[PDB]
RNA sequence: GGGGCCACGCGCGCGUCCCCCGAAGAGGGGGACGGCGGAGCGAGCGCACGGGGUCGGCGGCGACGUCGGCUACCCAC
RNA sequence: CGCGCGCGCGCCCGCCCCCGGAGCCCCGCGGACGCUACGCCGCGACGAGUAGGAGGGCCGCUGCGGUGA
């Protein structure tokens, strides 16, 4: 299996024509002139009395509805979410500093590690300073500043995934009757594995931060707007 | 605007479209390096 | 005796795949010829005048063969003689348009309905943008979109016209089979000018839109389409 | 003939119902109970019908005898069958298909039967 | 719990109010029922701005959902069990509604059977 | 807007017979199918004349028929009418014919069959 | 050994013709063309996607004084 | 005119069942979830209105004949 011998020039067009690709992949010297209900097909079995038996798979229905619904027609390119192409704005690069502006950890300044395989960003506004841990965040509910540091030398573990930053609730074994149904401890409690992860990272992030002077107060402060500060004027 | 719906009708336009790109890029290359040559010859 | 029939159908599919591959090769090549045609007809004009400006002469180029026509005034307060001439040209509604060929018969008609129209001497790009984008066919006294060449050929291939480019050739070069190609087309339904007009009640010498605005018609088409 | 009977019975009939922009028919042996040529028991030389047992267990099937018409007393055959709802449908499917008795009524029969058997249980606990 | 119909497309109604007759706000001999005006000097007829609006066919409603309740079902009126059993097969498109003149002792019967056959009733608790 | 006129955009032909004679309507069911599913125009014509009214279906006389079929070439060929056949007592020599029509008078019926002729209907046609 | 050809399968011819070995023609290379022999040959996968009108094999929050309810009672603008 | 042109199976010669069901978009065995044919489906263009003319009214009021076990 050879990777494609036709390069790309623009999406949907290649750099070569028919006659040339013919010659490259050598379609010359590659000429191939190559030119009663009795049959019980799948089901089988064996048992005791009267001889043997032939058991029949995928048995027929019991109950038919009174009215059914027809099928759909076909379409081209309606992929699912696990198959899309992920994009990213240009002003976001590993080490950049970003302003959160929607949630509970609102209006804080944090640090960007990388982008996962779902379009969501991994953020550590290091817990000592901002009181903000490893989280997932959306690239569009955030601002990127023009203020940066060098992070290339750093070890992010493999096991850190969208499957790991997942919520876990909605338990079916319930009475289904009473003043209940958010009562299985009602609360969130922290594992140790998270702690271990936060420590092992900020150990090697944080020294790089202190190589910049005054970079801590910027990461303990909080952003806001005031009188005479119009945001389209101010560059970030 | 749509490549295929154009070319279902007129197939030759894929070739005319493949041309007019390679030509531009080649023409871009010459001006830049040559204008660079004189500029470096200025200073 | 079933296998004989199966083989008979599987053969007979050859009749259709081979024909289609042939025809798609046909359409390719003609367009490649037409490419060469249009260049020569462009550069040839230039070559003449340079050859003539070298001497002290001049060059009176040919006169145009076809025209594009738009209607700009409505249907309210109009004369009988003029209501007739428009509905021969198939302009029964505002901002519709049709091509037309030029001779003593046509030109006098255009002088009669001068104040209500705006016409010009178009180029090749405008013919492309009209027909592909906003260009439909008249078929069985219905209005049907040009999505594929089956429609064109089936109704119009007895003239040697089997695709879009063959029209455009037949139109741009006013050919022998112009009448049929145009009357196949429904009159183009356009949108109002993006950017605005100066004053529709006057001629295009007094700051208006009416009359002949020969080469500047194309500037306008960019904004209606 | 059938169409002749029909062209009288479109609009005027005692089994006819017309209210609320709907139109139903209540003649015996009418599957889907609508006013139609394809679905009407009194019109054809071949018809099939399905009803519930009077004792209150199983399904009653009805088929016409084709030989002596115009004597309605002994024109209809009946059977009552009471099994586990997969044997019951399969039995029906075999009657119609293997005898070619009006085979454009197959699934209509089945849906009517299943409806009955679904009802003919403790639908309430 | 509640019997689900087969499909539940969204419903859209071009007009939601009613059309009142003209000059019915002044007077009491005049009613709310639409009667078309036919005078010469009249301005609803002549369609000025800021006036009553007259019903035409463009307000007309889509046909996939016409006479369709908010619950997806269409309606049907009964008087006894006999004409109820005709709905067995259309038990997911149409619903039942019992008349006003039926007695208490018989409503119980009809409900008891509609519940078996899975035929929804749009007024199951009236007299009691 | 569009400067056109709507005074002549409905056409004033028939689409169906205005009567409730049911035997007529079954004939109409038939010839629509043949007109819809065949490559002929004979079918078209007949369909158009079964809609017509009765002053557009005047009676044909046994006399004219003989004159029009004794002409050369029209030997052995069927005669077809969309109305009534009367008798003309001013004719004595009635030869062999193969007529098709809707109605046929009684005196005319006898003479035609007594020459060895034959009478058909549109069904058997 | 320049960039470019919807060029193409090669074995001896089906041909009008021609550059040349060759006398106008046959034989040799091919070309312009028609084209089809004295050859032309045809399965299994996939991207499909700028292809005959949208799907998510993607999610979160919320509960005896709160949720929904155009239409229909009042008031304001 | 190269998505069939002679493909396959036993032993060139022969077989050449084949949908009471092939295999995926044409099956010339019969059929729509549609077939109240006074029905169902699909395309494309149009919609001002006095006097006035026509049609459809499962809009309505009182009574007669049949019919809703
Ligand atoms: Mg005016
Ligand atoms: Mg603007
Ligand atoms: Mg102005
Ligand atoms: Mg004026
Ligand atoms: Mg309303
Ligand atoms: Mg007036
Ligand atoms: Mg009018
Ligand atoms: Mg008229
Ligand atoms: Mg009107």
Curated annotation (Swiss-Prot), chain A:
* One biological process term in Gene Ontology: cytoplasmic translation
Signal peptide limits: none
Residues bearing PTM N6-acetyllysine: 187
**Cell compartment(s), UniProt:** Cytoplasm, Cytosol; Cytoplasm; Rough endoplasmic reticulum
GO molecular function ontology, one term from the record: RNA binding
Keyword Glycoprotein attributed: no
Which Gene Ontology cellular component annotation is one that this UniProt entry carries?
A: cytosolic large ribosomal subunit
Asked if the keyword Cytoplasm belongs to this entry, the reply reads: yes
Question: What PROSITE patterns does this protein's entry cite?
Answer: RIBOSOMAL_L6E
Q: What is its main location?
A: cytoplasm
Q: Which residues carry this modification: Phosphoserine?
A: 75
Q: What keywords were assigned to this record?
A: Acetylation, Cytoplasm, Endoplasmic reticulum, Isopeptide bond, Phosphoprotein, Ribonucleoprotein, Ribosomal protein, Ubl conjugation
In this UniProt entry, the residues modified to N6-succinyllysine are 42, 155
Protein family according to the UniProt entry: Belongs to the eukaryotic ribosomal protein eL6 family.
The record's function comment reads: Component of the large ribosomal subunit. The ribosome is a large ribonucleoprotein complex responsible for the synthesis of proteins in the cell.
Q: What interactions and quaternary structure are annotated?
A: Component of the large ribosomal subunit. May bind IPO9 with low affinity.
What protein does this entry describe? Large ribosomal subunit protein eL6
What organism does the record attribute this protein to? Answer: Oryctolagus cuniculus
From Swiss-Prot, chain C:
| The keyword Oxidoreductase is annotated on this UniProt entry | no
Any single Pfam family the record assigns to this protein: Ribosomal_L30
Signal sequence span per UniProt? none
N6-acetyllysine occurs at 101
| Cellular component annotations (GO), alphabetically ordered | cytosolic large ribosomal subunit
Q: Which residues carry this modification: Phosphotyrosine?
A: 116
Cross-referenced Gene3D superfamilies, in alphabetical order?
Ribosomal protein L30, ferredoxin-like fold domain (3.30.1390.20)
**Which terms are listed as keywords in the entry?**
Acetylation, Cytoplasm, Phosphoprotein, Repeat, Ribonucleoprotein, Ribosomal protein, RNA-binding
UniProt-annotated location(s): Cytoplasm
One GO term of the biological process aspect: maturation of LSU-rRNA from tricistronic rRNA transcript (SSU-rRNA, 5.8S rRNA, LSU-rRNA)
Assembly description: Component of the large ribosomal subunit. Homodimer. Interacts with DHX33.
Name the protein family.
Belongs to the universal ribosomal protein uL30 family.
Described purpose of this protein according to its UniProt entry: Component of the large ribosomal subunit. The ribosome is a large ribonucleoprotein complex responsible for the synthesis of proteins in the cell. Binds to G-rich structures in 28S rRNA and in mRNAs. Plays a regulatory role in the translation apparatus; inhibits cell-free translation of mRNAs.
- The name of this protein is Large ribosomal subunit protein uL30
Curated annotation (Swiss-Prot), chain D:
User: Entry's InterPro entries?
Assistant: Ribosomal_eL28 (IPR002672), Ribosomal_eL28/Mak16 (IPR029004)
Query: One GO CC term of this entry?
Result: ribonucleoprotein complex
Q: Which gene encodes it?
A: RPL28
Classify the main location.
cytoplasm
The molecule here is called Large ribosomal subunit protein eL28
Listed Gene3D superfamilies:
3.30.390.110
Q: What is a single molecular function from GO for this protein?
A: structural constituent of ribosome
Known role: Component of the large ribosomal subunit. The ribosome is a large ribonucleoprotein complex responsible for the synthesis of proteins in the cell.
Any GO BP: translation
Keywords for this entry? Acetylation, Cytoplasm, Isopeptide bond, Phosphoprotein, Ribonucleoprotein, Ribosomal protein, Ubl conjugation
Cross-link Glycyl lysine isopeptide (Lys-Gly) (interchain with G-Cter in SUMO2) placement: 57, 64
Q: Where in the cell is it found?
A: Cytoplasm
Q: Which domain of life is it from?
A: Eukaryota
What is the taxonomic lineage of the source species? Eukaryota, Metazoa, Chordata, Craniata, Vertebrata
What Pfam families would the database entry show? Ribosomal_L28e
Swiss-Prot record, chain E:
- Primary localisation category: cytoplasm
Can you supply one Gene Ontology CC term for this chain's record? cytosolic large ribosomal subunit
Q: Which of the residues bear the PTM Phosphoserine? A: 61
Compartments reported by the entry: Cytoplasm
Query: Which residue numbers mark the cross-link Glycyl lysine isopeptide (Lys-Gly) (interchain with G-Cter in SUMO2) in this sequence?
Result: 8
The chain residues annotated with the modification N6-succinyllysine are 49
Keyword field contains Cytoplasm: yes
Q: Which SMART domains match?
A: Ribosomal_L32e
Q: Which GO terms describe its biological process?
A: translation
> What are the protein's GO molecular function terms?
structural constituent of ribosome
Question: Which UniProt keywords are present, listed alphabetically?
Answer: Cytoplasm, Isopeptide bond, Phosphoprotein, Ribonucleoprotein, Ribosomal protein, Ubl conjugation
The UniProt entry's sequence similarity note says: Belongs to the eukaryotic ribosomal protein eL32 family.
Describe the subunit structure. Component of the large ribosomal subunit.
General function of this protein? Component of the large ribosomal subunit. The ribosome is a large ribonucleoprotein complex responsible for the synthesis of proteins in the cell.
List, alphabetically, the PANTHER family matched.
60S RIBOSOMAL PROTEIN L32 AND DNA-DIRECTED RNA POLYMERASE II, SUBUNIT N, RIBOSOMAL PROTEIN L32
Q: What's the protein name?
A: Large ribosomal subunit protein eL32
Organism (species)? Oryctolagus cuniculus
Q: Which gene encodes it?
A: RPL32
């Amino acid at each position: 299996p050879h990777c494609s011998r036709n390069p790309v020039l623009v999406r949907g067009i290649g750099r070569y024509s028919r006659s040339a690709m013919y010659s490259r992949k050598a379609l010359y010297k590659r000429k191939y002139a190559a030119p009663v209900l009795a049959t019980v097909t799948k089901p089988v079995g064996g048992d005791k009395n009267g001889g043997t038996r032939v058991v029949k798979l995928r048995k027929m229905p019991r109950y038919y509805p009174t009215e059914d619904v027809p099928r759909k027609l076909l379409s081209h390119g309606r992929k699912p979410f696990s198959q899309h192409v992920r994009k990213l704005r240009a002003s976001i690069t590993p080490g950049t500093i970003l302003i959160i502006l929607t949630g509970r950890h609102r209006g804080k300044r944090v640090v960007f590690l990388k982008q996962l395989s779902s379009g969501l960003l991994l953020v550590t506004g290091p817990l000592s300073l901002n009181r903000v841990p490893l989280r997932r965040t959306h690239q569009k509910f955030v601002i990127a500043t023009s203020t940066k540091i060098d992070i290339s030398g750093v070890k992010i573990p493999k096991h850190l995934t969208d499957a790991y930053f997942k919520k876990k609730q909605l338990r079916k074994p319930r009475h289904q009757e009473g003043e209940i149904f958010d009562t299985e401890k009602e609360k969130y409690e922290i594992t140790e594995q998270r702690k271990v992860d936060q420590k092992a990272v900020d150990s090697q992030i944080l020294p790089k931060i202190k190589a910049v002077p005054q970079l801590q107060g910027y990461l303990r402060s909080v952003f806001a707007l005031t009188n005479g500060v119009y945001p389209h004027k101010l560059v970030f | 605007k749509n490549l295929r719906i154009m070319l279902k009708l007129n197939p030759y336009a894929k070739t005319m479209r493949r041309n007019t790109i390679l030509r531009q890029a080649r023409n871009h290359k010459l001006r830049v390096e040559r204008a660079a040559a004189a500029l470096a010859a200025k200073s | 005796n079933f296998a004989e029939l199966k083989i008979k159908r599987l053969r007979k599919k050859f009749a259709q795949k081979m024909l289609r591959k042939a025809r798609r090769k046909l359409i390719y090549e003609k367009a490649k010829h037409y490419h060469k045609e249009y260049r020569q007809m462009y550069r040839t004009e230039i070559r003449m005048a340079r050859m003539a400006r070298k001497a002290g002469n001049f060059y009176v180029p040919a006169e145009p063969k076809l025209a594009f026509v738009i209607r700009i005034r409505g249907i309210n307060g109009v004369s009988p003689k003029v209501r007739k001439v428009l509905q021969l040209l198939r302009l029964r509604q505002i901002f519709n348009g049709t091509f037309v060929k030029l001779n003593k018969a046509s030109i006098n008609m255009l002088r009669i309905v001068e104040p209500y129209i705006a016409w010009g001497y178009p180029n090749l790009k405008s013919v492309n943008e009209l027909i592909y984008k906003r260009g439909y066919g008249k078929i069985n006294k219905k209005r049907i979109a040009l999505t594929d060449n089956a429609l064109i050929a089936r109704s119009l291939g007895k003239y040697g016209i089997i695709c879009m480019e063959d029209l455009i050739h037949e139109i741009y070069t006013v050919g022998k089979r112009f009448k049929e190609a145009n009357n196949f087309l429904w009159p183009f339904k356009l949108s109002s000018p993006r950017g605005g007009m100066k004053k529709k009640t006057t001629h295009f010498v007094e700051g208006e839109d009416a009359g002949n605005r020969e080469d500047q018609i194309n500037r306008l088409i960019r904004r209606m389409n | 003939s059938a169409h002749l009977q029909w062209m009288v019975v479109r609009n005027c009939s005692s089994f006819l119902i017309k209210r609320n922009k709907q139109t139903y028919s209540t003649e015996p042996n009418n599957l889907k109970a609508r006013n139609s040529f394809r679905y009407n028991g009194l019109i054809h030389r071949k018809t099939v019908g399905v009803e519930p047992a009077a004792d209150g267990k199983g399904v009653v099937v009805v088929m016409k005898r084709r030989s002596g018409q115009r004597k309605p007393a002994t024109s209809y055959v009946r059977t009552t069958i009471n099994k586990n709802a997969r044997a019951t449908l399969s039995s029906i499917r075999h009657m119609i298909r293997k005898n070619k008795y009006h085979p454009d009524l197959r699934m209509a029969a089945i849906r009517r039967a299943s409806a009955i058997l679904r009802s003919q249980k403790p639908v309430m606990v | 719990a509640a019997l689900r119909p087969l499909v539940k497309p969204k419903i859209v109604k071009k007009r939601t109010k009613k059309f009142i007759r003209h000059q019915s706000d002044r007077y009491v001999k005049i009613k709310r029922n639409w009667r078309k005006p036919r005078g010469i000097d009249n301005r609803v007829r002549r369609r000025f701005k800021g006036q009553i609006l007259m019903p035409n066919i463009g307000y007309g409603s889509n046909k996939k959902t016409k006479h369709m309740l908010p619950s997806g079902f269409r309606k049907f009126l009964v008087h006894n069990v006999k004409e109820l059993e005709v709905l067995l097969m259309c038990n997911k498109s149409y619903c039942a509604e019992i008349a006003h003149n039926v007695s208490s002792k018989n409503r119980k019967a009809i409900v008891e059977r509609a519940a078996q056959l899975a035929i929804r009733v749009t007024n199951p608790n009236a007299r009691l | 807007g569009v400067d056109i006129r709507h005074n002549k955009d409905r056409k004033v032909r028939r689409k169906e017979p205005k009567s409730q004679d049911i035997y007529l309507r079954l004939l109409v069911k038939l010839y629509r199918f043949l007109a819809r599913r065949t490559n002929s125009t004979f079918n078209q014509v007949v369909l158009k004349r079964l809609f017509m009214s009765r002053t557009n279906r005047p009676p044909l006389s046994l006399s004219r028929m003989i004159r029009k079929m004794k002409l050369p070439g029209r030997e052995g060929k069927t005669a077809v009418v969309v109305g009534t056949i009367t008798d003309d007592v001013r004719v004595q020599e009635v030869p062999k014919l193969k007529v098709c029509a809707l109605r046929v008078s009684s005196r005319a019926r006898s003479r035609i069959l007594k020459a060895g002729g034959k009478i058909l209907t549109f069904d058997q046609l």
